[PDB]
Amino acid sequence: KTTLFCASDAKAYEKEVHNVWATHACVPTDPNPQEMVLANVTENFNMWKNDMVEQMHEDIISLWDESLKPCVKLTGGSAITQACPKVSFDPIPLHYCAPAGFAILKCNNKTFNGTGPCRNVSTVQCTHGIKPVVSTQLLLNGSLAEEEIIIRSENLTNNAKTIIVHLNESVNIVCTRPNNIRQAHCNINESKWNNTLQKVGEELAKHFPSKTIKFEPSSGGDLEITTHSFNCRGEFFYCNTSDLFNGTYRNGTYNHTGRSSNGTITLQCKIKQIINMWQEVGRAIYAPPIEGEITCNSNITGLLLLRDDTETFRPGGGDMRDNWRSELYKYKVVE
Amino acid sequence: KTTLFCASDAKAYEKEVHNVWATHACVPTDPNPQEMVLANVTENFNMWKNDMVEQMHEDIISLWDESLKPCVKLTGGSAITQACPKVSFDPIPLHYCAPAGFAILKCNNKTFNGTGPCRNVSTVQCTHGIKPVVSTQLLLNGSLAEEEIIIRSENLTNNAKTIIVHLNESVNIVCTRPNNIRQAHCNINESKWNNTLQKVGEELAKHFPSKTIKFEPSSGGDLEITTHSFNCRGEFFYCNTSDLFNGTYRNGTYNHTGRSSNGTITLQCKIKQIINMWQEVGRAIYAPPIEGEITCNSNITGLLLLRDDTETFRPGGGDMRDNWRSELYKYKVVEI
Ligand SMILES: CN(Cc1ccc2c(c1)[C@H](NC(=O)C(=O)Nc1ccc(Cl)c(F)c1)[C@@H](CNC(=N)N)C2)C(=N)N
Ligand SMILES: CN(Cc1ccc2c(c1)[C@H](NC(=O)C(=O)Nc1ccc(Cl)c(F)c1)[C@@H](CNC(=N)N)C2)C(=N)N
Numbered sequence: 001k002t003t004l005f006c007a008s009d010a011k012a013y014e015k016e017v018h019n020v021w022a023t024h025a026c027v028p029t030d031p032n033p034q035e036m037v038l039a040n041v042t043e044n045f046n047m048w049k050n051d052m053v054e055q056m057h058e059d060i061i062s063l064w065d066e067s068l069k070p071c072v073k074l075t076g077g078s079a080i081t082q083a084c085p086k087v088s089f090d091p092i093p094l095h096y097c098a099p100a101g102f103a104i105l106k107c108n109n110k111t112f113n114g115t116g117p118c119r120n121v122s123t124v125q126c127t128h129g130i131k132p133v134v135s136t137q138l139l140l141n142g143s144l145a146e147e148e149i150i151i152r153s154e155n156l157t158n159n160a161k162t163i164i165v166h167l168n169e170s171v172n173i174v175c176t177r178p179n180n181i182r183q184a185h186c187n188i189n190e191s192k193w194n195n196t197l198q199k200v201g202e203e204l205a206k207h208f209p210s211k212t213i214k215f216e217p218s219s220g221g222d223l224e225i226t227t228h229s230f231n232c233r234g235e236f237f238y239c240n241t242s243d244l245f246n247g248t249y250r251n252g253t254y255n256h257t258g259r260s261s262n263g264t265i266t267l268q269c270k271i272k273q274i275i276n277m278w279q280e281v282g283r284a285i286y287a288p289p290i291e292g293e294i295t296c297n298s299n300i301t302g303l304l305l306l307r308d309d310t311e312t313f314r315p316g317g318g319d320m321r322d323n324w325r326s327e328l329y330k331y332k333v334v335e
Numbered sequence: 336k337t338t339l340f341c342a343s344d345a346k347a348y349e350k351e352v353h354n355v356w357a358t359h360a361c362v363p364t365d366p367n368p369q370e371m372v373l374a375n376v377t378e379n380f381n382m383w384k385n386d387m388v389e390q391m392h393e394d395i396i397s398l399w400d401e402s403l404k405p406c407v408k409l410t411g412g413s414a415i416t417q418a419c420p421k422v423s424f425d426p427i428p429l430h431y432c433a434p435a436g437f438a439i440l441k442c443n444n445k446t447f448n449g450t451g452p453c454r455n456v457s458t459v460q461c462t463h464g465i466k467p468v469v470s471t472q473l474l475l476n477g478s479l480a481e482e483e484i485i486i487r488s489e490n491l492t493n494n495a496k497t498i499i500v501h502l503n504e505s506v507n508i509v510c511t512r513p514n515n516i517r518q519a520h521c522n523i524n525e526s527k528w529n530n531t532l533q534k535v536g537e538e539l540a541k542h543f544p545s546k547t548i549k550f551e552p553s554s555g556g557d558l559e560i561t562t563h564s565f566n567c568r569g570e571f572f573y574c575n576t577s578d579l580f581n582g583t584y585r586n587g588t589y590n591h592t593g594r595s596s597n598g599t600i601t602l603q604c605k606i607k608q609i610i611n612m613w614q615e616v617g618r619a620i621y622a623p624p625i626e627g628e629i630t631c632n633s634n635i636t637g638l639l640l641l642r643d644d645t646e647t648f649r650p651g652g653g654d655m656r657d658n659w660r661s662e663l664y665k666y667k668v669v670e671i
Contacts, residue, residue, distance in 0.1 A: 009348040031350075037627075093348055129348065146632075174367060297366040 001333055004055055007095045007126055016088040017067035018132075025062070029095060029126070036123035043121055045107060047114025047329035048154045056096060056324050060132045061279045068234065068286075071273075075282025084287035089234045091141060093129030098333060105332040110147040114329040115154070123334075130327050134278060135230040136317025137218075137241060139302030139326055144168045149199050152329065156207050156307075162316050164326050165303035171196055175237055177271060177294035184269035184294070186228075186239050190260045193244070197256070200303070201249035204313070212310040213249035217242050224276050225318045228267070232296035235289045239269040245315045278320050302326055337437045337668055339390050342430040342461050351423040352402035353467075360394070364430055368460055370441070376456045380442055382449030382664035383489035387431060387462075391659045394429075395467045396614045403569065403621075405610075410617035419622050424569035426476070428464025433668055440667040445481040449499075449664035450489065465662045469613060470565035471652030472553070472576055474637030474661050479503050484538045487664065491542055497651050499661050500538075500638035506531055510565075510572055510604060512629040519629065521563070521574050521602035525595045528579070532591070535638065536584030539648070547645035548584040552577045557611050560653045563602065567631035570624050574604040580650045613655050637661050 007029040010022035071084035098104050104127060108120040131141045145168035152164040171192050177184035201213050218226045218241075228239040243258030244267060258265060271294075273286040304323075306316035342364045345357035382388075406419035433439050439462065442453035468475045480503035487499040506527050512519035536548050553561040553576075563574040578600055581593030593600065606624045611617075641651035652658075 176367060293367075295366045 001051060002098070004052065004096050004098050004333075006059065007097050008092060010092055016090055016092075018063065018090065018092045021063045021066055022092060022094075026094070027097075032125075034125050038122060039108075039120045041121060042117055042119045043105065043107075043332070044116055045114060045118060045329070045332050046116075047152065047325050050325070050328065050332070052096060052328050052331060052333065053321050053324045056094075056132075056328065057321050060134070060320070060324070063132065064134075064279060068231075070275075070284035070286045072285040073277075073282060074285070075280065086287065086290050087234055089231065091131035091133050093131055095126040095129060096328075097126040102335045103333075105334045107330050107332075110145065111150055113150055113152050114325070124331075127328070127331055130324075133230070133323065134320055135228070135323065136225050137228040137245075137304055137315035138173070138230075138300050139164075139304065139323065140173075140230065140298045140300065142299075142301035143327055144170060144301060149203055151203060151207060152326075159307045162319065162322050163303075163305040163307065163313075164322060165200055165305055166326065167196065167200075167300070167302055169196070171300035173298050173300050175232060175239065175269060175296045175298065177235070177269075177289065179293050181291075182271040182289060184237060184239075184271055186237075186267040186269055188244065188265045188267070188300075190256070190258075190263060190265050193265065194247070194254065194256045197247050197249075198254040201254045204311075205249065208311045213254075214310050214312045215245050215247045215249070216312050216314055217245050218306070218314045218316070222276050222318075223272075224278070225316070228315075229317075230296075230298075233290070233294055235271050235294055236273070236275050236286070237269050237296075238272055240267045241315060243267070278318070336386065337434060337670070339387065339431050339433055339668065341394060342432050343427055343464075345427060351425050351427075353398065353425065353427045356398045356401055357427065357429070360398070361429070362432075364461070370457045370459055372443075372457045377452055377454045378440060378442070378456050378667070379451060380440075380447070380449060380453050380664070380667050381451075382487065382660050385660065385663055385667070387663050387666060387668060388656050388659045391429075391431060391465075391467070391663065392656050395469070395655070395659075398467065399469075399614060403566075405619035405621050407620035408612075408617065409620070410615075421622065421625050422569050424566065426466040426468055428466050430461040430464060431663075431666075432461035437668060437670050440669050442665050442667075446483070446485065447665075448485050449487045449660070462663070462666055465659075468565070468658065469655055470563070470658065471560055472563045472580070472639055472650035473508070473565075473635050474499075474639060474658060475508075475565065475633045475635060477501075477636035477661055479505060479636055484534055486538055486542060487661075494642040497654070497657055498640040498642065498648075499657060500535055500640060501661065502531065502535070502636055502638070504531065505634035505636050508633050508635050510567060510574060510602070510631045510633070512570075512604075512606060512624065514628055516624055517606045519572060519574075519604035519606060521604055523579065523600045523602070523635075525591065525598050525600050528600060529582075529589060529591050532582055532584070533589040536582075536589045539646075540584060543646050549645055549647045550580045550582045550584075551647055551649055552580055553641075553649050553651070557653075558607070559611050559613070560651065563650070564652075565631075568625075568629060570606050570629055571608075571610050571621065572604050572631075573607050574602040576602060576650055578602070580648075613653070 006026045010019040012023045073080045103125045106122045107118045133140045154161045175186040247256040304316040341361035343357040343361045345354040408415040439459045441457045443455040480501045485501040490496045510521040578593035582591045639651045640648045
């Protein structure tokens with residue numbers, strides 16, 4: 001429960017901003033696979049009370065703040081203009097490390113969520129490679145489970161608390177603004193999707209006995225949370241998910257209800273410059289998007305869900321601390 | 336003829352050896368590569384005399400050469416020793432692209448079997464993502480046929496030519512050495528396997544008029560070919576298929592005569608140190624297996640067969656060029 005610090009492999013000649021922040025504000029990693037394996041001790045974890053997240057969070061905020069400068073930043077009727085220079089942008093892995101004395105407890109093996117008991121435990125100094133991908137609804141470029149899909153929540157019996165669904169077979173998603181220049185779109189292969197929501201539905205049913213399971217879009221709110229919003233090559237993509245998070249889990253099987261066509265599902269995307277910042281409760285304005293093909297080839301690795309004779313589930317997000325929690329669940333700082 | 340170049344999503348921060356090699360041997364892939372479809376054409380392909388295969392072969396040889404360094408390398412009477420560190424091993428997709436002045440022809444006839452005429456043709460810059468998986472008998476993590484199973488051979492009536500069966504439904508296989516530190520095992524669901532060999536049995540029952548079609552284990556030879564040999568996380572697995580390739584397809588129906596248990600076929604595996612190199616003629620000796628659970632969860636996407644009243648088929652392999660052919664059958668390098 002003390003001051004941690006980051007390590008990475010960020011070359012110092014790279015103009016890309018995450019490297020520029022890293023080099024100046026981090027450390028080159030270590031090739032010491034220091035892994036004090038153990039398997040007695042059955043310790044308690046809690047991925048929701050865990051200061052590593054707040055630590056990381058207010059560092060991603062720093063990163064973003066130093067890096068992506070909006071033309072305008074409004075907050076409390078207070079405008080603050082500056083330069084809007086387009087930059088080079090791509091998540092590099094960060095490792096969070098503890099200084100002496102004493103470091104990081106890590107839970108091992110397969111099906112083990114974020115709360116409570118766990119047996120096989122190792123002790124480490126730093127953590128695995130983590131991209132600080134800022135996104136809603138869908139988790140991108142993240143890790144996988146080495147077995148079966150697993151469900152995470154501070155409380156599933158609470159319709160208010162975000163459900164982090166951790167997958168194990170990633171779903172390819174491809175976003176494009178071709179060569180109306182804030183009109184974009186995203187492709188997602190339909191079978192992998194139906195299959196995914198099938199499995200996730202199956203294990204959702206294992207936590208909600210004999211209820212029909214309905215996947216249905218978000219109720220409403222800001223475009224950041226009611227769509228799959230994310231950053232790509234500096235540009236802020238807001239991607240539709242009406243015909244993605246609609247589908248029915250019935251009888252023991254799942255069937256989709258989203259318009260497909262000869263294989264892939266297409267989502268309508270809008271690039272925007274006015275954004276409601278995830279860092280604080282203000283809003284930022286950037287310059288019009290760069291010209292040319294604006295494309296991102298990304299890996300869907302997790303879901304953010306929100307629950308309402310049927311149980312309804314809608315995509316969540318908003319809070320990036322959750323996005324960090326999705327992978328900082330494993331660990332716990334100790335003496 | 337040209338000198339292709341590889342392309343991948345290799346991470347420079349990744350210490351997994353395929354990434355390490357690909358980062359310095361290949362180019363970053365294009366996030367979105369576009370086909371150019373062609374009506375009007377009809378071109379001939381021959382998966383069995385393709386140079387792309389040899390090029391890829393060489394590349395994977397170099398890759399394995401730089402990556403997996405054996406403690407000992409023996410070739411006849413001459414032996415070489417060097418450092419043999421345990422590494423992180425997990426294949427990544429490799430694209431093969433033609434340089435400027437050339438292009439890659441791609442057949443989209445999804446019943447096309449590598450040899451002969453192909454009508455629906457497209458041109459591309461780079462191939463699809465191909466994981467250079469080295470294995471025998473079973474082809475792992477390949478692309479699936481898009482409709483009915485496909486039988487491939489340079490020559491079917493020649494029992495000396497290896498037959499490549501392209502499945503269209505992957506058969507999950509799970510190999511594991513649990514917590515004897517060299518004894519491991521694989522698990523396969525029997526139902527999927529029986530459906531598989533049923534349909535494969537049919538597709539073979541076509542090409543060979545009306546004969547009892549038997550599936551039997553490899554008659555003999557080196558363990559690398561008499562067993563399902565493959566690499567899991569740098570460790571060389573030799574898995575037993577006496578209970579897998581074991582059955583009879585007769586007049587419409589398949590019968591699995593191989594031992595099973597609770598619907599599961601379990602292969603008995605052995606992690607070896609002494610291997611017969613596939614790259615060249617000679618033996619390689621590696622260090623004892625690492626500690627902890629060594630598990631690989633893979634998908635069977637193809638089969639390698641050799642044919643002998645009744646027709647008998649046995650698991651083949653050994654020439655990894657076929658393993659590349661299994662994926663590179665669609666493609667043809669051309670100058671324009
Ligand atoms: C309140 N709520 C969900 C929720 C929880 C926490 C936060 C928010 C929302 C607000 N989040 C964001 O503004 C936000 O994430 N913006 C944002 C910025 C960049 C990217 Cl790529 C992105 F995906 C989202 C943040 C507050 N920000 C501000 N409004 N302008 C933090 C619901 N009622 N569902
Ligand atoms: C000759 N033959 C089949 C055949 C064909 C070609 C080749 C071979 C065998 C030899 N192949 C191999 O040694 C080989 O593939 N080894 C090998 C290494 C690693 C893995 Cl994972 C593997 F599956 C096999 C190679 C020659 N190597 C050498 N013996 N030491 C290449 C039959 N009579 N059935």
